[PDB]
Write a protein that binds this ligand. Structure first.
Ligand code: SF4
Ligand code: NI
Ligand code: NI
Length: 728
C-alpha cells in the first residue's frame, strides 16, 4: 500500500518548486523548536511524569495516535517523538521531504496544543467561546459519520484572513450554505463575527483559534479513521488512505503566507488534502493540484470543491418555515396537529410519474381544492401528491427510487411529518407550521426542489400537484393504483434464478468497514430499504457509487449458494477479512451485518430451530439475550455462524434461509412481528406444505422467553422443526 502514488506525476523531474520547499522546511524547523522548548519548560515546571492531554477524548493526541501510534499520556512521552520528528525534517528539497515536514509540523502543533491544555480545567477553560479549541469525541462521533458517509459533502479548513469581511463572509456564507463543515483558523473568525455571521458546533462552523490551533481540524479528521474506519493506531498509510477517500477536506489559506501556516498547509497535503490560497503564487512556490492560487474571491470556493472532487449543486425553495433533515422525526400529536392527511381517516395517495418534455412546466405547482387556510383547525382533508418528471437520461425504472424520497423530503421542513407510502400515507402539519405561513403550494416547493437537487443527471424538469379535493383524490388514486400494480408487479416477478447479476452495497462501510451486503431478488438488504431493483437503479443512476453489479460466476455450492464471484468481491471489499459467503444459510459463512438490521435470527440447538427477534422488540428472547445485546455480537461486519441480521421481508422470501430448512425452521418470534407478517407467513407456509395454520405453531413471548418454557408448546403443536435434522 503505497499511499504516495497519489503524488506521482505531480511535478516534473525539474520544476520542483524550491521556493515552497524552503518555506515549509524553515517553518517546520520552527514549529518543532517551539514544541521542543515549550516541552522542556513544561517538564521543568511539572515533572516528566506529569499527565498531559486533551479533554474529552479517548484518543490521547489523535494525530500522533493515528500516524505512528504512541498513546501520549505524560510529558516524558513527547520527548522521543519530537526527536524523531526533528530527524525527519530534511534539507533536500523534495516533495517528499516537504510532506514529511508537513507531518512533523502537525506533530509539533499537536504537542504544543496539548501542552497548552495543561492549564485547562472545566472551571478555568483556556480557549473559551466563541472558539472551540480541541473539539471533543462526542461531536466527532455525532457529526463525523455524517462526514465520512458524505451527507456533509466536504470540509473547509480556513486558515488566515480574507481580503476583507465582505470577502470572507461571502465565501463562508455560501460554502457554508452548500452544507459543508468548517474549521476556522485565525483571523477570519474575527472578520466573520464582525459581520454577525453566527457559527459554532450547532452550525458545524468551527472557530478553532489561531496559531497551532489549526491542528484541531487534523485531530478531528484523524479521529474519524480511528473511530469509524477501525484503523489500528499506527497504520500510517492506512490512515492517510482513509483521510483521502472519506474526508473531503481542503484548505483555504487566505492572507499572506507565513512559514508555519504554509508548513501546516503542507501537512494537510501529506495526508491528501489540497491547499487553495488567496495569494497569487509564482511558479516556484506551487504544486499543480496540491498547492494552488485562485485570487478571484468568486472562484476559490467553486474552485476548491472542484479540485477536491466535491460535487454538489443547490436548490432554492424560499419558504415560511424551517427546512432540512434535522426537522425530521418531528412528531405531530392531535394536540398540535393543525390538519391531518391520509391515515385511516381521509383519502390519501402519492405518485412520481415519468413524462415527455413537451408536457411539463418546470416549476409549475398546483393545489386543486381548499389549501391549508381553507380548513378547520384539527381538520382532516384528502390529498394526492403527483410529481411528474422528465429527463434525458430518465427511466420508468427510477420512478420507485424517486417516489420513495417523498416521506424523507416531506419530513425535512419543520412543522411537517409524513408516514407510510402510497395510498397508505399518513401526513400531519403542526399549528406552528400553518402559523409561520405554511401553505399547500409549499409542499410542491420543498419537493420539486429536492428531486432536482438529488438527481442531477437524469432529471431535467419537475412539476408537483397536491389535491385536497375529495373528488380529485379518488380519481387519481385509481390511476396510480394502476402504477402501483404495474410496479409492485415488477418486484414479485423477479427471482434469484431469473437474473444472473446481483448487486453489492457498500453504503454502511461508513460505520462497518468490513461489511459488504449482497442484494439479490429474493433477499432484500438487511436495513430493509434496498431491494435488488433499488440497487440496480442506483448503480445505473451512479455507475461509480456504492452499489455495483456482480455476475454469478464460478459456482461453488448450488445449495448453500456460494459463488467465487461473490466471494472475491467480498474478500476484496472487507479488507480481506471474509473469504466465503453462502447466500442460503446462516450456519456456515453467513453474510455479515452492519448495525441497521431490522431483525436478528439465531439458531437454538435446544429447540432445533430459529428464533427471530425484531429491532423494536424489547423482551427477553430464548437465547438469554435481548435484541440490543445480540445486536452487539451480530453487527460490525464479522461472520457469525448461527446468527444473522436480516430485513423483515426476507422472512417471507421463498429463498429464506432455504439451505437450512426455510420457514419451517422458525420456532419463536415476537407476537407483534408474527402478526405484522401474518399474511406472508400464511401464504409461504401454504406453498411450503406446512399448512394454513403453521403460524399458530410458532411460539412467541406469550408462550415463553426461555427454551424450557417453549419446548412443551412446540411439542403440543407438533411444530415441524422438531422432526427435521438438527442443524448443529
Ligand atoms: S444494510 Fe446493506 S443494503 Fe442496506 S444501506 Fe447498509 S450496506 Fe446497503
Ligand atoms: Ni446495519
Ligand atoms: Ni446498514
Amino acid at each position: 500500500i503505497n499511499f504516495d502514488q497519489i503524488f506521482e506525476g505531480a511535478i516534473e523531474p525539474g520544476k520542483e518548486p524550491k521556493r515552497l520547499f524552503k518555506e515549509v522546511y524553515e517553518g517546520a524547523i520552527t514549529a518543532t523548536s517551539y514544541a521542543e522548548i515549550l516541552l522542556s519548560r513544561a517538564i521543568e515546571k511539572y515533572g516528566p511524569d506529569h499527565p498531559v492531554g486533551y479533554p474529552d477524548t479517548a484518543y490521547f493526541l489523535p494525530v500522533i495516535r493515528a500516524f505512528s501510534g504512541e498513546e501520549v499520556r505524560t510529558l516524558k512521552d513527547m520527548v522521543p517523538i519530537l526527536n524523531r520528528m526533528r530527524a525527519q525534517i530534511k534539507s533536500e528539497l523534495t516533495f517528499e521531504n516537504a510532506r514529511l515536514a508537513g507531518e512533523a509540523t502537525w506533530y509539533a502543533a499537536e504537542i504544543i496544543e496539548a501542552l497548552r491544555y495543561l492549564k485547562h480545567t472545566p472551571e478555568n477553560p483556556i480557549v473559551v467561546p466563541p472558539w472551540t479549541g480541541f473539539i471533543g469525541d462526542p461531536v466527532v462521533r455525532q457529526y463525523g459519520i455524517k462526514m465520512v458517509d458524505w451527507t456533509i459533502p466536504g470540509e473547509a479548513i480556513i486558515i488566515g484572513r480574507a481580503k476583507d469581511s465582505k470577502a470572507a463572509k461571502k465565501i463562508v456564507d455560501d460554502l457554508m450554505g452548500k452544507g459543508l463543515m468548517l474549521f476556522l483558523c485565525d483571523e477570519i473568525i474575527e472578520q466573520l463575527l464582525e459581520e454577525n455571521v453566527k457559527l459554532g458546533v450547532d452550525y458545524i462552523a468551527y472557530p478553532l483559534g489561531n496559531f497551532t490551533q489549526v491542528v484541531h481540524a487534523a485531530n478531528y479528521a484523524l479521529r474519524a479513521g480511528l473511530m469509524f474506519g477501525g484503523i489500528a493506531p499506527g497504520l500510517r498509510d492506512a490512515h492517510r488512505d482513509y483521510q483521502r477517500r472519506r474526508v473531503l477536506a481542503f484548505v483555504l489559506y487566505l492572507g499572506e503566507h507565513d512559514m508555519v501556516k504554509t508548513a501546516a498547509a503542507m501537512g494537510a497535503i501529506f495526508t491528501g488534502f489540497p491547499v487553495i490560497t488567496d495569494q497569487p503564487l509564482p511558479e516556484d512556490k506551487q504544486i499543480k493540484d496540491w498547492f494552488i492560487s485562485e485570487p478571484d474571491y468568486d472562484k476559490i470556493v467553486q474552485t476548491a470543491l472542484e479540485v477536491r472532487g466535491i460535487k454538489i449543486t443547490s436548490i432554492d425553495i424560499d419558504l415560511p418555515i424551517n427546512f432540512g433533515p434535522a426537522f425530521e422525526g418531528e412528531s405531530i400529536r392531535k394536540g398540535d396537529m393543525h390538519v391531518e392527511f391520509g391515515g385511516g381517516k381521509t383519502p390519501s395517495f402519492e405518485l412520481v410519474r415519468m413524462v415527455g418534455p413537451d408536457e411539463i412546466e418546470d416549476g409549475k405547482v398546483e393545489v386543486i381544492g381548499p389549501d391549508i387556510d381553507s380548513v378547520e383547525p384539527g381538520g382532516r382533508l384528502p390529498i394526492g401528491i403527483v410529481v411528474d418528471i422528465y429527463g434525458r437520461k430518465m427511466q420508468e425504472d427510477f420512478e420507485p427510487v424517486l417516489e420513495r424520497r417523498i416521506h424523507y423530503f416531506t419530513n425535512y421542513g419543520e412543522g411537517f411529518w409524513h408516514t407510510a407510502q402510497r395510498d397508505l400515507t399518513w401526513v400531519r402539519i403542526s399549528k406552528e407550521a400553518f402559523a409561520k405561513g405554511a401553505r399547500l403550494k409549499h409542499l410542491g416547493q420543498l419537493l420539486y426542489a429536492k428531486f432536482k437537487q438529488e438527481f442531477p443527471s437524469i432529471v431535467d424538469r419537475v412539476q408537483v400537484t397536491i389535491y385536497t379535493d375529495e373528488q380529485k383524490v379518488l380519481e387519481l388514486r385509481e390511476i396510480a393504483r394502476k402504477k402501483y400494480a404495474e410496479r409492485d408487479a415488477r418486484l414479485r416477478e423477479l427471482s434469484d434464478e431469473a437474473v444472473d447479476t446481483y448487486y453489492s452495497c457498500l453504503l454502511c462501510q461508513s460505520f462497518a468497514p468490513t461489511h459488504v451486503c449482497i442484494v439479490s431478488p429474493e433477499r432484500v438488504g438487511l436495513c430493509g430499504a434496498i431491494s435488488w431493483l433499488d440497487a440496480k437503479a442506483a448503480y445505473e443512476i451512479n455507475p461509480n457509487g456504492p452499489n455495483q453489479p456482480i455476475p454469478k460466476e464460478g459456482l461453488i455450492d448450488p445449495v448453500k449458494g456460494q459463488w467465487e464471484s461473490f466471494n472475491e468481491y467480498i474478500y476484496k471489499n472487507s479488507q480481506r477479512t471474509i473469504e466465503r459467503m453462502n447466500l442460503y444459510t446462516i450456519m456456515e459463512y453467513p453474510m455479515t451485518s452492519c448495525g441497521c438490521f431490522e431483525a436478528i435470527m439465531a439458531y437454538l440447538p435446544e429447540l432445533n430451530g430459529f428464533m427471530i427477534v425484531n429491532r423494536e422488540h424489547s423482551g427477553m428472547t430464548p437465547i438469554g439475550m435481548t435484541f440490543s445485546t445480540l445486536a452487539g455480537m451480530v453487527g460490525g461486519g464479522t461472520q457469525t455462524p448461527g446468527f444473522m441480521g436480516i430485513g423483515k421481508s426476507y422472512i417471507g422470501s421463498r429463498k429464506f434461509v432455504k439451505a437450512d430448512g426455510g420457514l419451517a425452521r422458525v420456532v419463536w418470534m415476537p407476537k407483534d412481528l408474527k402478526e405484522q407478517l401474518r399474511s406472508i407467513i400464511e401464504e409461504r407456509a401454504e406453498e411450503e406444505g406446512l399448512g394454513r395454520d403453521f403460524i399458530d405453531k410458532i411460539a412467541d413471548e406469550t408462550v415463553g422467553t426461555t427454551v424450557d418454557e417453549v419446548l412443551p408448546f412446540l411439542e403440543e403443536k407438533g411444530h415441524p422443526a422438531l422432526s427435521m435434522e438438527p442443524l448443529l
